[PDB]
Paper text:
Two glycosyltransferases (GTases), SdgB and SdgA, are responsible for the glycosylation of S. aureus SDR proteins such as ClfA and ClfB. SdgB first appends N-acetyl­glucosamine (GlcNAc) moieties onto serine residues (O-glycosylation) within the SDR domain using uridine diphos­phate N-acetylglucosamine (UDP-GlcNAc) as a donor substrate. The subsequent addition of GlcNAc to the glycoproteins is catalyzed by the second enzyme, SdgA, yielding glycosylated SDR proteins in which each SD repeat is decorated with GlcNAc disaccharide moieties. The glycosylation of SDR proteins mediated by SdgA and SdgB protects SDR proteins from degradation by host proteases, thereby circumventing innate immune attack.
Despite the biological significance of these two glycosyltransferases involved in pathogenicity and avoidance of the host innate immune response, their structures and the molecular basis of their activity have not been investigated. This study reports the crystal structures of SdgB and SdgA from S. aureus as well as multiple structures of SdgB in complex with its substrates (for example UDP, N-acetylglucosamine or SDR peptides), products (glycosylated SDR peptides) or phosphate ions. Interestingly, SdgB undergoes a conformational change from an open to closed complex upon substrate binding. In addition to the dimerization role, the inserted domain was found to serve as a binding platform for the SD repeats before and after glycosylation.
Numbering used by the authors:
A (entry chain E): 1 to 4
B (entry chain A): 0 to 308, 312 to 317, 321 to 501
The structure:
Amino acid sequence: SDSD
Amino acid sequence: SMNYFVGNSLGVNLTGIEKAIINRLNLFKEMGRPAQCVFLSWNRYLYRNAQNYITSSDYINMYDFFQEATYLERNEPFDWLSYWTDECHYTLKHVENSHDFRIYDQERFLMYAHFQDPKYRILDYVNHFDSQRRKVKRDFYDVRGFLSCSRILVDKQQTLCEFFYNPEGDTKLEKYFSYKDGKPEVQKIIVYYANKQYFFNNETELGAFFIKQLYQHGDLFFSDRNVYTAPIFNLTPESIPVVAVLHSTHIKNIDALDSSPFKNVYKAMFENLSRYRAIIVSTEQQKLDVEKRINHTIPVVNIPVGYSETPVQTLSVKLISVARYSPEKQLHQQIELIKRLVSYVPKIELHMYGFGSESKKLNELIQKYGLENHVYLRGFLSNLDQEYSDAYLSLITSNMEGFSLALLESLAHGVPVISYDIKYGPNELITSDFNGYLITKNDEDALFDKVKYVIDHPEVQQRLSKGSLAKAQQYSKASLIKQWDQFVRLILEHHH
Ligand SMILES: O=c1ccn([C@@H]2O[C@H](COP(=O)(O)OP(=O)(O)O)[C@@H](O)[C@H]2O)c(=O)[nH]1
């Protein structure tokens, strides 16, 4: 959720 | 006097059109005419993907141009890790199984950073978070090192707007988005150029502006990715000369020459034909059909998309097929052919180079027919120059084709060919009884008989192979140079  | 070949980008794996654009550039380099590749899309990796094929002076990217990053190259690498630690006093936490870091101001989570390499010398992106861990902005770094674009997020990480920066950090372009079918669609563009602001509604209007800024009197433009480049030139004045290059069949149904609609990708060009000085196709056969379809309203010219340039014919009996594993190519038939032939020629083998959806089905028919030591799905191969030296014959059993660089190369290696007589490509590279044979589409029995005949007649295969060497030589670098120079000379004087 914090990486893409 | 500059010649612009306008495609869209360059990927890690070059497409046909990207190959064709680079090859045309190389010829124009030799010939001595100024050429550059024009790319349109935003691709912060373009400089890496390009490096193995062209130079920074050899292309202008639209977004690089307005970001004042045209011709720029790689920065000295920058230790982001030590900047964040030693200079910023942030707290870094490596994520395992990745090139990633969470970046903290003590307890506070600030940022998530993706590095491309495992040596963390290529910062790729950095996500920023607010006090509720909501992801508010994404910073996208060009491979050359600068921060290329920031993207502002709303709701469920939806793209609201983007800002594009020159390498010193000034904002040079703005873009605003609204979602449609689950995806962001551009609704506005602002561009800071020439100490002014310019406004646009979409990326076709910006490209048209881009084109105008490059154009000096005497330049010549080539529309090569017509789904995008054709709507752009259609919004630029007729005083700017532009040639449409088609890189595939021009109509949805080759079997209804007069009436089939044009392909979707070529619709906008064909509906505004008087905008363009000419159309270039890769085969004489397709030149003749397009000329008749448009009623000669503008010139059509065939210029091949590729050119010809190791021991050859070192002859078991090796059949080959260089073709994507797709429906069109009808590769099962080549298995069927081998099924019948092995009983008469059991030292035969058929190597199928390429890849695609139909691999599983093709592996099965091999097993079914017990040909596992006769038909090999050899996958995709980075160079085939060794594979051609001992190929007896090549086979094409497709129902639709285009001009084949692969076929052209195989004919430079002396490999004759037997092919269905379908459009386009086969008839360009294959003169019956000179370098191969042309068979009626889907006549698996004439296919067998002609394939059988050449195997039973090595001296025929010699003639055909010598004919393939002769065929290839008509596509020489210098032949292509001469066509291209002539075409550019003639196009520009008519536009006087
Ligand atoms: O397994 C393969 C298949 C294709 N090619 C290369 O792909 C280029 C284009 O061939 P073709 O036009 O047949 O490819 P397509 O456009 O049909 O995918 C040629 O130079 C081939 O040598 C290759 O190196 N290995």
